[PDB]
Amino acid sequence: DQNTEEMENLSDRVASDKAGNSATNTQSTVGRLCGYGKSHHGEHPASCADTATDKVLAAERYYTIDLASWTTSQEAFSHIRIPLPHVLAGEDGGVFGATLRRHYLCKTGWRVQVQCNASQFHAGSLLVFMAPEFYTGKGTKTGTMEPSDPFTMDTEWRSPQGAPTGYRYDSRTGFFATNHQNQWQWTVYPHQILNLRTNTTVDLEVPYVNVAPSSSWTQHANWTLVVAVLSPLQYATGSSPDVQITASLQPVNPVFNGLRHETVIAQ
């Protein structure tokens, strides 16, 4: 189901989204999940007496960057996580990031687009889904208890472990931990599939939900994005192995308030 079409990628499968002074195109879409059912109204935080910095064009655009390389080698449910805000955080994050750390609080929603184009003699299936409270880390900390690098952008892929007991942490054992995940239910999150067969692209938009109408970006990361693979990349001797996966994102109608003087640290 969707319009008439293909070897080549056609019509009601060609979509475009313009935002700011950055404009996108895909000639082989299957939708765009507006995850949950509502978007984000630049509804001012009721929390603050701060009549904040609103409707700035300059930050409300599409920042694009590379996540990783997909290749024949990888095993199912191996995964790659992208926390928002903390990856659009500075340098690579335009005027958004700047105004982002000059301010105490933000409240935004994200509109994401992950791209991975192949060829009709390629098999595989990439699962893309946005989940708020989730896990990052990239580590078991040094020498003193608690837990390595959530802000880092998983440089390489992590190993589906024959068992949650969600990478607990201080030399121990017996039993599980509150960072569990059942990568086996990991399709209750607003998601969308990327089937080299069907899909060259996948668009997801998600509203604002933390514990407070606005949160602080120096200790939390309300949503982590996950580009982890559910049916690997077979390739027949001829053919383009190098399956370059790219992601391009857009904060939707952020509302910043609580302004001050350029946050200082990232190792």
Cβ of 83: how many Cβ atoms within 10 Å? 23
- Residue 5 or 170 having the CB closest to its own copies: 5
* 66 belongs to the binding site for its own copies (CB under 8 A): no
- In angstroms, the first-to-last Cα distance of the chain is 48
Cα separation, 19 vs 221, whole angstroms: 24
State the minimum distance, in angstroms, from the CB of residue 227 to its own copies. 25
CB contact at 8 A, 80 and 154? yes
Q: Which tokens in the block code for residue 177?
A: 């931990």
Among 25, 72, 120, 148, binds its own copies (CB under 8 A): 120
- Residue 14 or 209 having the CB closest to its own copies: 14
State the minimum distance, in angstroms, from the CB of residue 11 to its own copies. 5
Q: Which residues contact 264 (CB under 8 A, 6 or more apart)?
A: none
* 23 belongs to the binding site for its own copies (CB under 8 A): no
State the minimum distance, in angstroms, from the CB of residue 16 to its own copies. 13
Q: Which tokens in the block code for residue 35?
A: 């995850």
* 7 belongs to the binding site for its own copies (CB under 8 A): yes
Among 8, 91, 146, 262, binds its own copies (CB under 8 A): 8
Longest dimension (CA), the chain: 63
* 5 belongs to the binding site for its own copies (CB under 8 A): yes
Residues that bind its own copies (CB under 8 A): 3-8, 10-11, 120
